[PDB]
């Protein structure tokens, strides 16, 4: 899965 966690 793609994760955007900033």
């Amino acid at each position: 899965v793609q994760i955007f966690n900033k």
Partner: antibody
Amino acid sequence: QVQLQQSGAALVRPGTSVKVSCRASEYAFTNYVIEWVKQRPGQGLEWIGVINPGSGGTNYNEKFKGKATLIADKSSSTAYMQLSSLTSDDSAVYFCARSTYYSGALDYWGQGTSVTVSS
Amino acid sequence: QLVLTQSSSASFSLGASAKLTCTLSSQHSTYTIEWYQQQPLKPPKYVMELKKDGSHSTGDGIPDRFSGSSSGADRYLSISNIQPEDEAIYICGVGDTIKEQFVYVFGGGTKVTVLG
């Protein structure tokens, strides 16, 4: 109205360091992340890193660890990038850009800071 | 790792339909990319978010001629009427969090020359 105003053109002597500044306007600084990108020589962009303004959380491109240092100061709604021990390779246009904490889109970009490294 | 692939240059008879290819590393064939437009001494411009279902979500200032589609590991930017002003470098960007570290990766860019 959403505006990212970056610092002016800077002449850096080789082997020295530079601080570039990105001041946010017309939005809540802490609600978004500030990202930094370098203009490549012929065509293209090179991601340097991102700063989470509320947490101080920084991620970097492997290549810029020990070269770049991202900081942000909630008070003045301004983000700063320090680039260290500069060579002529560091001579380029550096941009700051805004992104959500959830998506990859850099939706609003700064005007750019042109860095010249020379003796 | 995460790699976006584009041809450097593409040319299109003015008025014709342009289709630009940004291929994703096979391990990440389902990823959502962004398109960006790079023109001279101007900051780069946000074009769209493009998901795997072909769903697109273009940014402010972008004409209808700009469309988006997906075909597996291939993300596409379609310009219906290739106009002189559309002449630019088109770059695709992608984000992922490996470990707890956020990376963003740009492709090499496609310099589009409008011909005729």
